[PDB]
Design brief:
Layout lengths: L4 E5 L7 E5 L10 H6 L6 E4 L15 H16 L3 E6 L1 H15 L6 E5 L15 H10 L2 H14 L1 H6 L2 H15 L16 E5 L5 H4 L13 E5 L12 H13 L3
Parallel strand pairs: 2-3, 2-4, 4-5, 5-6, 6-7
Antiparallel strand pairs: 1-3
Helix pairs in contact: 2-3, 5-7
Family: Belongs to the ATP-dependent AMP-binding enzyme family.
Protein name: Vlm2
PDB class: hydrolase
Length: 255
Amino acid sequence: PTAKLVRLNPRGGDGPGIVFAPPAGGTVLGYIELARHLKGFGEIHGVEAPGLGAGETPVYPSFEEMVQFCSDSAAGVAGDGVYIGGHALGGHIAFYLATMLLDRGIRPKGLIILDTPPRLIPVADADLTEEETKVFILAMPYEEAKQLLLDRAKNDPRVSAFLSEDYLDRFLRLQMHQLMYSRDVVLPQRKLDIPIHVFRTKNHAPEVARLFSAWENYAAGEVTFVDIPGDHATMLRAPHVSEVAQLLDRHCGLP
């Protein structure tokens, strides 16, 4: 598990580091741009899910085994003082990851949630047809639904030109597997004593937007809700990710 701890950015500031848990599909590539723009943090790491690397066998662990894998991978660096962060499904894993680190005698500096409410999940849906959006809704003929998302990705020249087709296949298989994760998790979810920071976009449906406030129920101390530009996907890409990084530096970092 420690071989899948990816250092996304060397120390740039004086504040603590961050260890990100990956979203549905298990990849940390989505945190690259954000990590490069961060100025007031220590080392920025991300936990790449097992089985995505080219020299690995595809594996499909449960939600709980994924939390354990992330805890085992991050425990080494988490002892140097770091936030635990997560975007999308990664935000749910992050809550349980911080909890499991507390059980191992490692206290994270805080919990950083990137535009997801508690597991009581939003989907971009902006650049997807009605037929393609149905797959995510249904997931949350199997091989036909997977082929729809596969052909959609390949239509993008950035995917067909630079992304490994083996990596894309492994990501999609794991994404489908994780989208089907049961809602309930066989892990405790008591209130955390560490501060929680929720960075949320302002393009959510009322059913999702109202659910963000439920993060208060999982905090015994400080909770902070910060508005960020973009939607659930574009927040991590230009031109928004620059402002997202600035807000993370302001609220959680120390340049």
